[PDB]
Write a protein that binds this ligand. Structure first.
Ligand code: HEA
Ligand SMILES: CCCCC/C=C\C/C=C\C/C=C\C/C=C\CCCC(=O)O[C@H](COC(=O)CCCCCCCCCCCCCCCCC)COP(=O)(O)OCCN
Ligand SMILES: CCCCCC/C=C\CCCCCCCCCC(=O)O[C@H](COC(=O)CCCCCCCCCCCCCCC)COP(=O)(O)OC[C@@H](O)CO
Ligand SMILES: CCCCCCCCCCO[C@@H]1O[C@H](CO)[C@@H](O[C@H]2O[C@H](CO)[C@@H](O)[C@H](O)[C@H]2O)[C@H](O)[C@H]1O
Ligand SMILES: CCCCCCCCCCO[C@@H]1O[C@H](CO)[C@@H](O[C@H]2O[C@H](CO)[C@@H](O)[C@H](O)[C@H]2O)[C@H](O)[C@H]1O
Ligand SMILES: C[C@H](CCC(=O)O)[C@H]1CC[C@H]2[C@@H]3[C@H](O)C[C@@H]4C[C@H](O)CC[C@]4(C)[C@H]3C[C@H](O)[C@]12C
Ligand SMILES: [C-]#N
Ligand code: CUA
Ligand SMILES: [Cu+2]
Ligand SMILES: [Mg+2]
Ligand code: NA
Ligand SMILES: [Zn+2]
Lengths: 259, 49, 46, 144, 227, 514, 94, 84, 105, 73, 79, 58, 43
């Protein structure tokens, strides 16, 4: 019997299935890019989803159902999530560096100007501004959800979290529409490259963050959270504010200043 | 009581040194390795053009 | 639960030193040989 | 006496010249005569014989300072063995030269080198220090 | 060029390379001194039976250990940066020559007046003439006027390469879409050799650079004859 | 039971053992690649007759030695085994995520071997610069398999860094401050912070290379307004932190080994050692462009990067002099691990000093992309990282296994290695000063003598590596079980015996505040 | 504006989380979350070291701000002394 | 800034719901109106086969290799111009 | 810090404590030999008499050994210390390591 | 038999260190003087002596007559 | 008119190792000038300095590609 | 909906020695076998693809 | 460190076998490839 407060985790197959899913996704992308086949990639995406589902299912079993998340364990998970977010900030930093490198020193092939000759940027006061209001609003509603949960108010937590998710979905649909309507593409030199890869990774993170909020929504429906213990909600809110801040930097840098 | 080094250290040292010197001298001089030393003081320059 | 102690906290057996020699020979030998056989492979394509 | 693995959390004996009085005695169990010797130790030590004094020491301690600090012939084995294996390496190099390496380029032929040397001197390669500086252009010979 | 058993830099052909040699001598002396001092103190710490194993106070000796290295670094940086800025100083060239890297050869363009350009390939080993240097000779050398300040401009028409001539202290990467400038001034006539210095694929080892430094009037006539 | 224990592990010691096994196997791959390099160069002319293959061998040599040998051994192996024991913690913070950091590495290595097997390999240099690494000069799958290998190794280490930072911050005894944790623990925490910040930037850069190769982006292609030099910045913004990541855990192990075999209870100048590692970590992010002094950068930028790079010698010097001050007054035990550490101190000092030579951008013009750089970094990596690894391996092998090595054999091994690596790399200084480029499969004839000696040195180290395998075999073959280890009062990782039970610190240590 | 419906920890915490929460209410620390406060450490007033077995590792920070911690096994029985500073510790098994 | 609002008589769920419905969603509604007033297709510009645009160094891994992933025939010309 | 005399005096006082126990005897000698000095005869005298009060002949001999060891290559120190201690050695019947043969390797 | 004199018994390690750190310093000075003399100054003098009366046209004519140039016969 | 042109002089607008924009600017300037002169009926001879500078500095293939793109209508700079 | 967390706590704390990833019941075993089958089978397939791609098609 | 005598002592003869086998495991496969290099450049 232990007399510390930390969690000795049962031996688990999900690290191995996650690692193999990484092998299958990357060898799958290689097979798709070079050997005209999606098969390995589809297996890898499937096993990756299965791994994520059973791994985080088990974390819920260990905490809500078995009681292993003492305050010391929760404190470690807080550090873990903060450090993960920091690494994701630095990943985006590389794409912002690429954007500023190319736009501050536009080469002759571009016309020696930014935006390049032949590029017609989107109007930042149209859908991009709408998207900004959508994500900012969702940062307000997720804050309402957090306070409702802390105050023990089930119905208003669910309402505010549902509004937050709806806004995340609205952003995603608006962005998908903008992608389709944009007269430039990812193959339109470094303007298209920086635009779609940086906003595209951001959009993937909006989808990830929205999925995490949806997990929290169903856990809330099933009463998993207490008014004082709900780190999965806190982590999803931190991740959601990160997604909102990355958007604000994209909006100012690429859509507005880069127009 | 005497250990491995008391009993065999002298012979290991002597044989190992002798073997090492002999085989490196052989490798260095007898099997056609071209060390390409400096020609200074060694090569008589010869007309080339 | 699991075996504890010397020779038991490892994923390979050390119960017989000659079987162990074989296993270590295959293990480190395969790693050391691999680049030579990759070079051979690339030379044999062209 | 006999040290056991399952004893690892108990105070243990060491012979270290910087830790002269270890945490336990070398020998804890005493025979009848050893018990009598420890009782005699409570009287004047002038009444102990030399042999009794040595046995008290060897009950308390395993090795003396002179024993634990003794030098050894190990360096002969280490140096001799290292030179053996370095010598064995040259066998591998002989094998490589014989069976792996083919001829080197024709530019190492003695006549090529002699011509190349003259041409390096004709173009005054390294004329301040490195190469042509060592050639006497007046006497047509390497400087002494 | 380098010569057999060489230990140090090729002899300087330009004043800047002369500067680098004296600066390297200065820095290497410091390198030897610090390396030797460390080896010696190691051996001193390891050669006594005397002991002192109780806690030792550190803040006095750490002042020495930081201040002395900081001073030494400053004594390296000052001459280092002086050469850096002198390399960058304006010197107004008499001639501009471009070189374009390719897999696997250099081309050269001298277009101040006429449209002069040519390719420069390694002489294959089987075609060397007696006395010529394996992997270093080219078919068409970069003829240049001696004793004059020359602007080199370096680029590439495919992958990265890098245009180097050690005895002149030159190494400038050759980047497609970019025109990198360096300056060259040879104090002497002769033949000065370099080799491609950014890995560029399977024949990176085999695209060398040969400068042929001659008087201006010979350079002018060679230039005319190469049109 | 075998699969549960060794494929589904949630145990920091068994995972550490997996990493040490993986790293040792990778070290044989990386050593064989290094011998093929030196065989090609060991006489003038061509050995493989295929310099694309030579370039692939050079590239893989570096990736294997860095990503599959040094980082898994130092951080995955010694870090997992030792960090929880040294702070009295019952395991790592995320013991199951820790297992995925391990299991991502065999697939990462598989992708790298696949890159060398398909097409003509990735003959790029481990820098993977475009356009050589782009889809025209390296068409086909090899470079993409290399990119994906790096992706997986990057995820493994980023998650590992999250684990180590969290464990070290959160799981010490409540009375133990950060200034009461051992220096090896500090060294792993700082390495983990460097990994956390730097690897995402590499991930961004190689992802951009992947999309330029497959999605028709042009981040690095001037035809679309891109710039090959942007890739170099992103790569080296990671790559300079990376060289400090490769050495910092070695610095931590060297502190412990020198303290232990000096018979001391503590290293000299603990807080200065912490200061020095933190300073090295911080400065390690503001110096990267010294890998780019010949790309055409403005002179004031080259002056700044010269100056900032030199600053690092100050905290590094404090650590060297503090190791010397730890020896001072010691009851010196001439164990094989002590020999490794003493070799480390001197050979690391030599390589750090040639690094200070290179920091001078004006001299670096002539030395860049020559064997002088190769000599600099093999003194810090093959006589620094490898000597710290061998020292830590010899020192802690009895803790991990319960068995002792034969010390005479281990001293013979050290002696052979010390001769071999110095014969290999010392002459490369002369080759660099005299202008021999790196990444070359053959050289002008003048360079023959030093290349011949360097290649003969490489075979001496081969003999040392073969003997190391025999020495490990002899220890497990003879089964001399550990009894008593000195200095446990200041080396907590030994206090649970050899090997420690599967679960340690189930009851945590008692440490009062006073 | 303000129904309920969210469980509290008192209602729904379980397992070790609940044990820690209940013990804390009683001012007890069975899972070692807090640092113990030292006694004067004399042989008369030894530091009392709880254990669920008959030995536990002590780490002694002999003086405030020492970076070196001194580690040793404390066994059931007579009090033992830190080998560096001599301050006394006694095991209290339970 | 203090913004221009100003409650903090204690913080809570009621205030953040107030901000959600009183400021945040009205802002979204206004930007949604603004956007729906300036929607409607911009007339596509003359096609000019600029070499820094419509990059093709390797075929795309889908379709005929020559269409971007969210190709819009109305506004995205191919390297050879707009589709028919 | 403290004078040499003050240092020596608090070590003499340490070993002279009449009811010094075995742990304190070991702690004292094992701490003392960490310092950069060979202990003065007056310190060694007090430690040897502590050995006598603790009925521990062997530790008395070991203390004489560690005096010789702390002198390192300074071969003149140990014979001087033994000289200064001979009245105590005679009084307490302590044989030196040399008289017991314990200086043989 | 005469008594032995009291030798120094304290600070022997520190005394040894002090003495040899000073010796290490004096050697480093002595080496720096040698290296400046055998290497650095030798180099300055070799380059200054070489160029003092150097005639670049005479050098060129020698090279040209030896046949080394593509541009000059 | 300031002939005896040898090569392009130092230009404080472009003092650094990267001379790409120097080549580009003088190419633009020459062709802008040649446009304004051929148009307004004047003499391209006043454009000569820019012509000599860009011919000295610019790689042949850059000039050639830029000329091709001007003919094609795909030159992305403003002339 | 109703709060059934207590029922789930009873289930996952039952003293049956099952590891947490199987302690839900037989559906866990099915999902585990599907996942591991896809991973191991996919990995073998990836090795087949490496073998295929390692040769110009010989 | 101290340790027990070997539970399964490895005699000098046994060590010569283990060492020889270890060296041959490294040397023979690489030696075979390198000996046959010229054969490979043929195809
Ligand atoms: C362990 C890995 C490691 C480490 C720790 C270092 C440490 C340093 N390196 Fe190293 N380096 C590499 C691995 C490493 N390097 C690699 C792999 C490359 C090549 C990458 C590639 O191109 O593939 C490289 C390339 C490289 C370059 C680029 C050269 C080029 O490509 O042209 C430079 C330039 O500044 C450099 C400088 C330094 C410096 C100043 C240090 C400093 O941190 C050293 C500080 C240490 C000391 C100075 C010695 C101890 C100090 C004292 C005893 C105090 C007194 C000293 C003085 C006052 C000077 N390194
Ligand atoms: C709200 C938007 C969400 C986007 C979802 C769409 C699918 C993309 C998935 C997201 C991954 C994000 C970054 C991947 C990089 C490229 C995608 C960029 C975003 C995007 O979707 O870009 C689209 C192109 O996608 C393309 O090339 C092909 C895109 C599909 C292939 C991606 C394969 C590469 C993945 C590499 C991942 C490496 C990760 C490493 C992490 C460590 C833009 O379409 P377009 O027709 O060019 O122009 C619009 C013209 N009307
Ligand atoms: C294509 C492939 C990519 C697909 C990605 C798909 C979507 C993934 C969306 C993420 C969903 C995460 C769900 C996590 C649920 C488990 C959870 O939230 O677990 C919580 C712990 O938090 C925890 O582990 C926190 C666990 C950390 C979760 C981090 C999630 C973000 C990471 C996403 C992957 C990033 C990829 C980046 C690519 C560039 C459980 O503790 P509590 O909540 O306190 O409950 C206990 C109380 O009930 C007691 O009273
Ligand atoms: C049990 C756990 C999981 C293990 C799953 C293992 C699955 C094995 C599937 C093998 O099927 C292959 O699929 C290829 C693609 O993968 C086909 O290639 C085809 O696919 C392309 C497009 O979809 C076509 O363009 C090409 O003609 C064609 O070669 C090909 O006929 C076939 O040999
Ligand atoms: C960097 C790596 C360093 C490795 C150094 C290797 C040292 C040598 C190990 C010996 O290797 C063997 O050498 C034999 C020759 O001595 C080869 O036999 C070959 O040559 C024989 C003699 O000509 C024939 O009998 C055999 O059939 C033929 O395979 C054999 O294949 C190979 O395994
Ligand atoms: C049925 C449920 C009551 C939850 C509970 O107390 O068990 C109520 C309370 C809050 C409700 C949700 C919130 O009102 C937010 C959403 C409002 C939408 O109009 C319907 C779905 C929506 C998601 C609601 C579904 C459902 O009526 C919920 C979930
Ligand atoms: C080194 N960097
Ligand atoms: Cu061109 Cu290397
Ligand atoms: Cu660096
Ligand atoms: Mg380079
Ligand atoms: Na070669
Ligand atoms: Zn204490």
């Amino acid at each position: 019997h232990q007399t510390h407060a930390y969690h000795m985790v049962n031996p688990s197959p999900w690290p191995l299935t996650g690692a193999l899913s990484a092998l299958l996704m990357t060898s799958g992308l290689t097979m798709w890019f070079h050997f005209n086949s999606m098969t390995l990639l589809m297996i890898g995406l499937t096993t990756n989803m299965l791994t994520m589902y059973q791994w985080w299912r088990d974390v819920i079993r260990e905490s809500t159902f078995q009681g292993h998340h003492t305050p010391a364990v929760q404190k470690g998970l807080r550090y873990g999530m903060i450090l993960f977010i920091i690494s994701e900030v630095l990943f985006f930093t590389g794409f912002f560096w690429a954007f500023y490198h190319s736009s501050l020193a536009p080469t002759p092939e571009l016309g020696g100007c930014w935006p390049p000759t032949g590029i017609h940027p989107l109007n930042p006061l149209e859908v991009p501004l709408l998207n900004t209001s959508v994500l900012l609003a969702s940062g307000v509603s997720i804050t309402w959800a957090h306070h409702s949960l802390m105050e023990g108010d089930r119905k208003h937590m669910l309402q505010a979290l549902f509004i937050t998710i709806t806004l995340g979905v609205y952003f995603t649909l608006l962005q998908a529409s903008e992608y389709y309507e944009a007269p430039f593409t990812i193959s339109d030199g470094v303007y298209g490259s920086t635009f779609f890869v940086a906003t595209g990774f951001h959009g993937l993170h909006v989808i990830i963050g929205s999925t995490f909020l949806i997990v929290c929504f169903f856990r809330q429906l099933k009463f998993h959270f207490t008014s004082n213990h709900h780190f999965g909600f806190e982590a999803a809110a931190w991740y959601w504010h990160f997604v909102d801040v990355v958007w604000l930097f994209l909006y100012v840098s690429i859509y507005w200043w880069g127009s | 009581a005497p250990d491995f080094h008391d009993k065999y250290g002298n012979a290991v040292l002597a044989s190992g040194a002798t073997f090492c010197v002999a085989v490196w001298v052989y490798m260095a001089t007898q099997i056609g390795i071209e060390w390409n030393p400096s020609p200074v003081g060694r090569v008589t320059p010869k007309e080339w053009r | 639960h699991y075996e504890e102690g010397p020779g038991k906290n490892i994923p390979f057996s050390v119960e017989n030193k000659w079987r162990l020699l074989a296993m270590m020979t295959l293990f480190f030998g395969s790693g050391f040989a691999a680049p030579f056989f990759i070079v051979r492979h690339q030379l044999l394509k062209k | 006496s006999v040290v056991k693995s399952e004893d690892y959390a108990l105070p243990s004996y060491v012979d270290r010249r910087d830790y002269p009085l270890p945490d336990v005695a070398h020998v804890k169990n005493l025979s009848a005569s050893q018990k009598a010797l420890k009782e005699k130790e409570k009287a004047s030590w002038s009444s102990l014989s030399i042999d009794e004094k040595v046995e008290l020491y060897r009950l308390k301690f395993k090795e003396s300072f002179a024993e634990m600090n003794r030098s050894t012939n190990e360096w002969k084995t280490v140096v001799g063995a290292a030179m053996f294996f370095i010598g064995f390496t040259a066998l591998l190099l002989i094998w490589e030269k014989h069976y792996v390496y083919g001829p080197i380029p024709h530019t190492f032929e003695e006549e090529w080198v002699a011509k190349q040397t003259k041409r390096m001197l004709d173009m005054k390669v390294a004329p301040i220090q490195g190469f042509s500086a060592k050639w006497d252009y007046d006497k047509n010979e390497w400087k002494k | 060029m380098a010569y057999p058993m060489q230990l140090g830099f090729q002899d300087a052909t330009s004043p800047i390379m002369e500067e680098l040699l004296h600066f390297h001598d200065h820095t290497l002396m410091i390198v030897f001194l610090i390396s030797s001092l460390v080896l010696y103190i190691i051996s001193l710490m390891l050669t006594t039976k005397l002991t002192h194993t109780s806690t030792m106070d550190a803040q006095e000796v750490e002042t020495i250990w930081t201040i002395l290295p900081a001073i030494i670094l400053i004594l390296i940086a000052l001459p280092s940066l002086r050469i850096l800025y002198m390399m960058d100083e304006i010197n107004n060239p008499s001639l501009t020559v471009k070189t374009m890297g390719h897999q696997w050869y250099w081309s050269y363009e001298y277009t101040d007046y006429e449209d002069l350009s040519f390719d420069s390939y390694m002489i294959p080993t089987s075609e060397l003439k007696p006395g010529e240097l394996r992997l270093l000779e080219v078919d068409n050398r970069v003829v240049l006027p001696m004793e004059m300040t020359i602007r080199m401009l370096v680029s590439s028409e495919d992958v990265l390469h890098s245009w180097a001539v050690p005895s002149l202290g030159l190494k400038t990467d050759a980047i497609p879409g970019r025109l990198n400038q360096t300056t060259l001034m040879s104090s002497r006539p002769g033949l000065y050799y370099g080799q491609c210095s950014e890995i560029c694929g399977s024949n990176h080892s085999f695209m060398p650079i040969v400068l042929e430094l001659v008087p201006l009037k010979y350079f002018e006539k060679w230039s005319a004859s190469m049109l | 039971m075998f699969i549960n224990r060794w494929l589904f592990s949630t145990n920091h010691k068994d995972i550490g053992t997996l990493y040490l096994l993986f790293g040792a196997w990778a070290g044989m791959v990386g050593t064989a690649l290094s011998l093929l390099i030196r065989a090609e160069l060991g006489q003038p002319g061509t050995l493989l007759g295929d310099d694309q293959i030579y370039n692939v061998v050079v590239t893989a040599h570096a990736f294997v030695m860095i990503f599959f040998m040094v980082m898994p051994i130092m951080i995955g192996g010694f870090g997992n085994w030792l960090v929880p024991l040294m702070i009295g913690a019952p395991d790592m913070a995320f013991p199951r995520m820790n297992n995925m950091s391990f299991w991502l590495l065999p697939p990462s290595f598989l992708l790298l071997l696949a890159s060398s097997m398909v097409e003509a390999g990735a003959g790029t240099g481990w820098t993977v610069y475009p356009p050589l690494a782009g889809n025209l000069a390296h068409a086909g799958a090899s470079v993409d398999l290399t990119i994906f290998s790096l992706h997986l190794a990057g995820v493994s280490s980023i998650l590992g860094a999250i684990n180590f930072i969290t464990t070290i911050i959160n799981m010490k005894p409540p009375a133990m401050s950060q200034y009461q944790t051992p220096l090896f623990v500090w060294s792993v925490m700082i390495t983990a912070v460097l990994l956390l910040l730097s690897l995402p930037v590499l991930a961004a850069g190689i992802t951009m290379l992947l999309t330029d190769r497959n999605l028709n982006t042009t981040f690095f292609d001037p035809a679309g307004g891109g710039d090959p030099i942007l890739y170099q910045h992103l790569f080296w913004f990671f790559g300079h932190p990376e060289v400090y990541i490769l050495i910092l855990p070695g610095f931590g192990m060297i502190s412990h080994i020198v303290t232990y075999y000096s018979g001391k209870k503590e290293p000299f100048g603990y807080m200065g050692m912490v200061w020095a590692m933190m300073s090295i970590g911080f400065l390690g992010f503001i110096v990267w462009a010294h890998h780019m002094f010949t790309v055409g950068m403005d002179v004031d930028t080259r002056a700044y990067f010269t100056s900032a790079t030199m600053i690092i010698a100050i905290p590094t010097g404090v650590k060297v002099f503090s190791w010397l001050a730890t020896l001072h007054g010691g009851n010196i035990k001439w164990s094989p691990a002590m020999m490794w550490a003493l070799g480390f101190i001197f050979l690391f000092t030599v390589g750090g000093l040639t690094g200070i030579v290179l920091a001078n951008s004006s001299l670096d013009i002539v030395l860049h992309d020559t064997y002088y750089v190769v000599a600099h970094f093999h003194y810090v990596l093959s006589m620094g990282a490898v000597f710290a690894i061998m020292g830590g391996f010899v020192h802690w092998f009895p803790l991990f296994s319960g068995y002792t090595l034969n010390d005479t054999w281990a001293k013979i091994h050290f002696a052979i290695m010390f001769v071999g690596v110095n014969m290999t790399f010392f002459p490369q200084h002369f080759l660099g000063l005299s202008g021999m480029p790196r990444r070359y499969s053959d050289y002008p004839d003048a360079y023959t003598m030093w290349n011949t000696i360097s290649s003969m040195g490489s075979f001496i180290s081969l003999t040392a590596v073969m003997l190391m395998v025999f020495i490990i075999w002899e220890a497990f073959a003879s089964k001399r079980e550990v009894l008593t280890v000195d200095l446990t009062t200041t080396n907590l990782e030994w206090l649970n015996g050899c090997p420690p039970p599967y679960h340690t610190f189930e009851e945590p240590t008692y440490v009062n505040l006073k | 504006a303000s129904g309920g419906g969210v469980p509290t920890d008192e209602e729904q915490a379980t397992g070790l989380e609940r044990e820690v929460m209940l013990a804390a209410r009683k001012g007890q620390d069975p899972y070692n979350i807090l640092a113990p406060k030292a006694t004067s450490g004399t042989k008369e007033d030894p530091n009392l070291v709880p254990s669920i077995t008959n030995k536990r590792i002590v780490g002694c920070i002999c003086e405030e701000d020492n970076s070196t911690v001194i580690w040793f096994w404390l066994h059931k029985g007579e009090a033992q002394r830190c080998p560096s500073c001599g301050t006394h510790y006694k095991l209290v098994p339970h | 800034a203090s913004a221009a609002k100003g409650d903090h008589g204690g913080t809570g769920a009621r205030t953040w719901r107030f901000l959600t419905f009183g400021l945040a969603l009205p802002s979204v509604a206004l930007c949604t109106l603004n956007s729906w007033l300036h929607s409607g297709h911009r007339e596509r510009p003359a096609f000019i086969p600029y070499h820094h645009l419509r990059i093709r160094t390797k075929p795309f891994s889908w379709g005929d290799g020559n269409h971007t992933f969210f190709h819009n025939p109305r506004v995205n010309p191919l390297p050879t111009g707009y589709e028919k | 810090h403290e004078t040499d005399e003050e240092f020596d005096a608090r070590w003499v006082t340490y070993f002279n404590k009449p009811d010094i126990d075995a742990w304190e005897l070991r702690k004292g000698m094992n701490t003392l030999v960490g310092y950069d000095l060979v202990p003065e005869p007056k310190i060694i005298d007090a430690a040897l008499r502590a050995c006598r009060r603790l009925n521990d002949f062997a530790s008395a001999v070991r203390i004489l050994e560690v005096v010789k060891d702390k002198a390192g290559p300074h071969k003149e120190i140990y014979p001087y210390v033994i000289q200064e201690l001979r009245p105590t050695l005679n009084e307490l019947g302590i044989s030196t390591p040399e008289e017991l043969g314990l200086d043989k390797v | 038999s005469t008594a032995l004199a009291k030798p120094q018994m304290r600070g022997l390690l520190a005394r040894r260190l002090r003495f040899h750190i000073v010796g290490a310093f004096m050697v480093s000075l002595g080496f720096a003087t040698f290296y400046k003399f055998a290497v650095a100054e030798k180099r300055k003098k070799a380059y200054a002596d070489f160029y003092r009366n150097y005639d670049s046209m005479k050098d060129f004519e020698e090279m040209r007559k030896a046949g080394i140039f593509q541009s000059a016969k | 008119k300031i002939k005896n042109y040898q090569t392009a002089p130092f230009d404080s607008r472009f003092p650094n190792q990267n001379q790409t924009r120097n080549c580009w600017q003088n190419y633009l300037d020459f062709h802008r000038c040649e446009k304004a002169m051929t148009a307004k009926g004047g003499d391209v001879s006043v454009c000569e300095w820019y012509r000599r500078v860009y011919k000295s500095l610019c790689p042949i293939s850059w000039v050639s590609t830029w000329d091709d793109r001007r003919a094609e209508g795909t030159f992305p700079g403003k002339i | 909906f109703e709060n059934r967390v207590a029922e789930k706590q009873k289930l996952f704390q039952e003293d049956n020695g099952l590891p947490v990833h199987l302690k839900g019941g037989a559906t866990d075993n099915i999902l585990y076998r599907v996942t591991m089958t896809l991973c191991l089978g996919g990995t073998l397939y990836s090795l087949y693809c490496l073998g295929w791609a390692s040769f110009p098609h010989k | 460190i101290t340790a027990k005598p070997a539970k399964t002592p490895t005699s000098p003869k046994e060590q010569a076998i283990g060492l020889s086998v270890t060296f041959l495991s490294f040397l023979l496969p690489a030696g075979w490839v390198l000996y046959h290099l010229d054969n490979y450049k043929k195809s």
